[PDB]
Amino acid sequence: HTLVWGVWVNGVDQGDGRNIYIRSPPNNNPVKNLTSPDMTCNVDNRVVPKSVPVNAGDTLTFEWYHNTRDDDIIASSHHGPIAVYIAPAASNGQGNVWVKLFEDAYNVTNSTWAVDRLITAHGQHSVVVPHVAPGDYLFRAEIIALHEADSLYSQNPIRGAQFYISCAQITINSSDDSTPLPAGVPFPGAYTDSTPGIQFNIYTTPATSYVAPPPSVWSGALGGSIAQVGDASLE
Numbered sequence: 001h002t003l004v005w006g007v008w009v010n011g012v013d014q015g016d017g018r019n020i021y022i023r024s025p026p027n028n029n030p031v032k033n034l035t036s037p038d039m040t041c042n043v044d045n046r047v048v049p050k051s052v053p054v055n056a057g058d059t060l061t062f063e064w065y066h067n068t069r070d071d072d073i074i075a076s077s078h079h080g081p082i083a084v085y086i087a088p089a090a091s092n093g094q095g096n097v098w099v100k101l102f103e104d105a106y107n108v109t110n111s112t113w114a115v116d117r118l119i120t121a122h123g124q125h126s127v128v129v130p131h132v133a134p135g136d137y138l139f140r141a142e143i144i145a146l147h148e149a150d151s152l153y154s155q156n157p158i159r160g161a162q163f164y165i166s167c168a169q170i171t172i173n174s175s176d177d178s179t180p181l182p183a184g185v186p187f188p189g190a191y192t193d194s195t196p197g198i199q200f201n202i203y204t205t206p207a208t209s210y211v212a213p214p215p216s217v218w219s220g221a222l223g224g225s226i227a228q229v230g231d232a233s234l235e
């Protein structure tokens, strides 16, 4: 159970984005139904009044929280991967539009899941803004908590992989469009019950054997990291 508070650009806090530049749902409950329109941008997908200006090559940092800003972030039980996607705003995230800019699942050196390192990072994870066409975009940050992912939601709706999905409205101003955005996957649609990484038993299967759901990260990406860029407590 986690939500996005706002974003940082190049290490500068853009301010509380909830219902402003983040298409925020009303609470931190997970999405579990892989076929639901809620997979696109969570349960209250609508245009919000602001879009954060960035340029290609900027660092865009999502900041997550549990109950209050810079708290425990997400329950430690919620081991799983983190991804970021991009699509043009004109899509409203419909169709074959979502391009993967970032993937982190399990780090064998530190023996940590992406989620574990997100807590250590005070909720902060980043992508580098790609050289796509200037214009309005949705950046879809996705945490998958696997603590009940031994079951499939489609079979047992009180269990399943848990998706914490947040869409940020981002406007790319300065970009040479040298890496124009390639075809995307649909959400809902890309993840199915047979997709690698959707059904997994983190209690019996070695984390080293985990494979995150496709698609692969776009070669055009520059992203990106799970790491604290700014200190929320200084504000």
Ligand SMILES: *[C@@H]1O[C@H](CO)[C@@H](O)[C@H](O)[C@H]1NC(C)=O
Residues within 6 Å of the ligand: 033, 034, 035, 036, 037, 157
């Ligand atoms: C899952 O989502 C689909 C598509 O909206 C819907 O038809 C189905 O009823 C949902 N399942 C549950 C258990 O709500």
Ligand SMILES: [Cu+2]
Residues within 6 Å of the ligand: 001, 002, 030, 075, 078
């Ligand atoms: Cu939770």
